[PDB]
Amino acid sequence: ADKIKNAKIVFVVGGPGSGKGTQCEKIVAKYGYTHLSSGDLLRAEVASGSERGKQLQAIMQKGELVPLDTVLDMIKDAMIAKADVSKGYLIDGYPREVKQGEEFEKKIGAPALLLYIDAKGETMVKRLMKRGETSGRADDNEETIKKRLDLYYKATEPVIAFYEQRGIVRKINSELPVDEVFAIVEKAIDEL
Numbered sequence: 001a002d003k004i005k006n007a008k009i010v011f012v013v014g015g016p017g018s019g020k021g022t023q024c025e026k027i028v029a030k031y032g033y034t035h036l037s038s039g040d041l042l043r044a045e046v047a048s049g050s051e052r053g054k055q056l057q058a059i060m061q062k063g064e065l066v067p068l069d070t071v072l073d074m075i076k077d078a079m080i081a082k083a084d085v086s087k088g089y090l091i092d093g094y095p096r097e098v099k100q101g102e103e104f105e106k107k108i109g110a111p112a113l114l115l116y117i118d119a120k121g122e123t124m125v126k127r128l129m130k131r132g133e134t135s136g137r138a139d140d141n142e143e144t145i146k147k148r149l150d151l152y153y154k155a156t157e158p159v160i161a162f163y164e165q166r167g168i169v170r171k172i173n174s175e176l177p178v179d180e181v182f183a184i185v186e187k188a189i190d191e192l
């Protein structure tokens with residue numbers, strides 16, 4: 001526990017399809033951070049066949065936010081499972097609300113960096129549609145896209161302004177080619 005609490009922790013925040021997972025995989029290979037995706041954890045619980053998984057599946061297929069306690073407990077347990085060995089943690093897709101950040105800080109520890117993966121709204125819509133047309137997830141349909149984006153703009157963008165009060169946000173232009181985005185992310189990571 002005091003081990004995870006004192007670890008470097010990076011929050012990765014950005015709209016659906018903005019390129020969070022993409023950039024996080026490149027961080028892992030280059031710097032050796034531990035990548036925890038809130039969405040991957042939740043989808044793994046869905047695939048387990050549990051009753052909790054059936055309810056998560058419903059929530060996610062509607063594009064809605066899973067309750068804080070559910071996602072936070074999964075993230076904590078996944079941090080613990082990898083605590084022995086981390087150079088640091090990339091928490092991808094959490095927090096999605098201010099209260100999510102605040103509870104993570106109370107239970108786990110503070111973020112040193114918030115990578116704000118910043119894509120245009122229409123770029124996200126097009127990206128999520130392109131994925132949807134070629135083997136996307138079940139939530140990559142048009143109607144669910146609308147709800148995922150709405151919640152990002154209303155609930156999640158406030159997270160940026162929140163952690164901007166402590167100067168830890170770095171804005172990453174995720175409209176550039178993947179490798180050019182990564183060069184900006186490297187600049188941010190090297191500050192740690």
Ligand SMILES: Nc1ncnc2c1ncn2[C@@H]1O[C@H](COP(=O)(O)OP(=O)(O)OP(=O)(O)OP(=O)(O)OP(=O)(O)OC[C@H]2O[C@@H](n3cnc4c(N)ncnc43)[C@H](O)[C@@H]2O)[C@@H](O)[C@H]1O
Binds near residue numbers: 065100178
């Ligand atoms: N904290 C939380 N609290 C409550 N509920 C939660 C929660 N976390 C999750 N949930 C629930 O789970 C759901 C799923 O959430 P989750 O899976 O966490 O998040 P997401 O934002 O929906 O995941 P995406 O995979 O759509 O986006 P990504 O930004 O990682 O993009 P990627 O790199 O793949 O890239 C997308 C596409 O774009 C392309 N691309 C990426 N970067 C670039 C680039 N620079 N140039 C060109 N194309 C690019 C990629 O090839 C790819 O095709 C939520 O809606 C909610 O229901």
